[PDB]
């Protein structure tokens, strides 16, 4: 049990380091990279405490470091700040989602599952807020938010055994939609239309995923919880 | 009392010394809890006071109050941590140990929060914060009884990062890169210590636990290495650039030497060596890209050769699979070849060219002597031997093309044959299948011929 006590202070320390760098720094790209690496580096402690796969965690950390190197190389080249920030955020998003997806497999216990879900939800909400604060390009911000929300929906769906393809299809559609939004932006299309299309596709995607989850379920109180979660997602 | 001082004292150095006195004395009061030797508190107090007096004198000499503040707070954090850890040693009670550790964490938090306001220099402020956070994590980690060597090594890493940061601040670099370096390495260190603690609680086997240290040392080293070249690319002074290159190379080499000494598993050590060789080679090549006087270039080459040999020698001391060892030392040697070739392209006079060509030829020859001294099987030794003969050929001819005149060329004409003969003769003393041995000696008889024919072509 007490391993949770260890992980708590470890994570708090990592967050403090992130904040200190955020205030002390004087260059946006470096600040983004610092926080990006710190958050993922921290999450591994919680994953390890639950008994997650160690090799997967190490690989995820390596991937985060590689993303940071790529972004630093681009910024030294004088590349656009917006693209680099979006790339770093998206890489962190997939990495953290992968860690959560590995952790979800560790055990059948509802209690551990609830703990994992809560951890993932808190991290996702904080990340969405931070990205909304940093990214200036409208389409980039919108797509970041949509990707985060969709990933959170998939994470929740895992807790009830819903089909994985029900999530994968929405992820593919969302990736196609974000690529389409970037293409329309490059095509000179009106921004408002791109944002509307993105949000509408995201809405239908999350709706379909949640509906499939509700169909797959057979527990009343589980259905009530799913309804509450769907309401929260729609509100956001 | 410290609050009043920090609120109302008008001078930064005076405030720093005031809060340092308050914090040290309050740490002593905390230490009074459980009978730990009073001499420890006396020593910490005396160190704090003498350092404060020295800083005040330097300020009276016109030195920067910011540097004095950073030094004073560094000493304060060190003293608080040392006292708390010694208190942790004075008892066997688990609950007492974790309570003491929580109080020590609170103290570290307080000292760090106090530091962030007083320190005006962004780089020094970042460094102080990193120092405090690292020491806090380590002092806490001791509570559960993990080996102290790992914590000491992590402290050493943090300290080396701080040393590099202060050196670059003296160099006058852009503050953003340095702040990123400090905070990034601090995060890596903190998460590494936490992960090790987690493994300890889980009661993992040491063959598993060691892996995390290798994972951490690689990233930390590469993280500092990457920062070095970013900073160096914006400098303009040759002496300063060479100083940065040599200093960082030496520091990274020392850290890897320590880590390789500590770790105690085969595959982990193999991978760690494989990564470290590349890290140092890349840093050396990056430094070599910038111009220098011939002697400055020669010093850079000499340092790199010393480092790669030193690491390889370290691995030789360790039990490890024969084939993996051969690949490691063969692969390492190839890196020396490349940097030797890259450096040779920049020279413009025979004296340096001949000296470097001979030096690398000897160095590359030497390493194989050690590897062959412990190879476990004939086939593994043979393959490594063939590669060695081929390697020295590439070094020889690659130099020959740039060589100026026969009066110089005679030295390589002699030394290449000498090296080939030494390698072949040393390989002849080992036990191996005669048919393979004949082939190996045949290749030696072959390669020297072309070297002589190319040399004959003035």
Residue numbers in the entry:
A (entry chain Z): 2 to 237
B (entry chain V): 238 to 695
Question: Would you copy out the relevant sentences from the publication that reported this structure?
Answer:
Here we describe extendable linear, curved and angled protein building blocks, as well as inter-block interactions, that conform to specified geometric standards; assemblies designed using these blocks inherit their extendability and regular interaction surfaces, enabling them to be expanded or contracted by varying the number of modules, and reinforced with secondary struts. We construct twistless helix repeat (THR) protein blocks from identical straight α-helices (typically 2–4 helices in each unit); the length of the blocks can be varied simply by varying the number of repeat units. Restricting helical geometry to ideal straight helices with zero helical twist in principle considerably limits what types of structure could be built, but this is more than compensated by the great simplification of downstream material design, as illustrated below. Using X-ray crystallography and electron microscopy, we validate nanomaterial designs ranging from simple polygonal and circular oligomers that can be concentrically nested, up to large polyhedral nanocages and unbounded straight ‘train track’ assemblies with reconfigurable sizes and geometries that can be readily blueprinted.
To generate expandable nanocages, flat cyclic components that form the faces of the cages were linked through noncovalent handshake interactions at the specified angle. For the flat cyclic component, we used a ring design with 12 repeats (R12B) constructed from curve units, and split the 12 repeats into either 3 subunits with 4 repeats each (C3) or 4 subunits with 3 repeats each (C4), depending on the desired polyhedral symmetry architecture. We then fused linear THR arms onto each subunit constrained to point outward parallel to a radial vector emanating from the symmetry axis, but offset such that when the C2 interface is formed, the C2 axis is along a radial vector. For tetrahedra (T3), octahedra (O3) and icosahedra (I3) built from flat C3-symmetric objects, the out-of-plane handshake angles that are needed to join the flat objects are 70.5°, 109.5° and 138.2°, respectively. Tetrahedral, octahedral ‘cubic’ and icosahedral structures with C3 rings at respective axes (T3, O3 and I3), and octahedral structures with C4 rings at the respective axes (O4) were constructed by incorporation of the appropriate C2 interface. Designed geometric features including the spindle-like twofold handshake interface and the flat ‘in-plane’ ring areas with distinct holes are clearly evident.
